[PDB]
């Protein structure tokens, strides 16, 4: 029981972050390459977030 | 380029008309969705033509 408590404590910061890190650079790659023009910054951002 | 050259007169007229009407090109507010018509499932056979 203590091990599950500790593992859920750890997974709230080491697993909830994995979508974020990939999302951040993926968006910036799209912006740099030209696939996200300045008229689609928020559209693509929130598409990646969801 | 040939496609844009072919449609040059219509696109010039459209640009002039949009600038005169003061429209914003593109669709900001990408989240907007039209509201459901009142009593939609059962009020479909009503004439609303001008
Ligand atoms: C984007 O949405 C924002 C927030 O809803 C809009 O700002 C509001 O615009 C309405 C309509 O003019 C105003 O009544 C509100 O007072 C505005 N709120 C604020 C905090 O400024 C904004 O106009 C929208 N932008 C575009 C380009 O559609």
UniProtKB/Swiss-Prot annotation, chain A:
Induction: Up-regulated in failing heart. It comes from the Eukaryota. Ubiquitously expressed, with highest levels in lung, kidney, heart, gastrointestinal system and prostate. Monomer and homodimer; homodimerizes following binding to an inhibitor. Interacts with calmodulin (CALM1, CALM2 or CALM3); interaction takes place in the cytoplasmic region and regulates phosphorylation and proteolytic cleavage. It is linked to Ischemic stroke: A stroke is an acute neurologic event leading to death of neural tissue of the brain and resulting in loss of motor, sensory and/or cognitive function. Ischemic strokes, resulting from vascular occlusion, is considered to be a highly complex disease consisting of a group of heterogeneous disorders with multiple genetic and environmental risk factors. Renal tubular dysgenesis: Autosomal recessive severe disorder of renal tubular development characterized by persistent fetal anuria and perinatal death, probably due to pulmonary hypoplasia from early-onset oligohydramnios (the Potter phenotype). Dipeptidyl carboxypeptidase that removes dipeptides from the C-terminus of a variety of circulating hormones, such as angiotensin I, bradykinin or enkephalins, thereby playing a key role in the regulation of blood pressure, electrolyte homeostasis or synaptic plasticity. Composed of two similar catalytic domains, each possessing a functional active site, with different selectivity for substrates. Inhibitors of ACE are commonly used to treat hypertension and some types of renal and cardiac dysfunction. This is Angiotensin-converting enzyme. It comes from Homo sapiens (Human). The lineage of its organism: Eukaryota, Metazoa, Chordata, Craniata, Vertebrata.
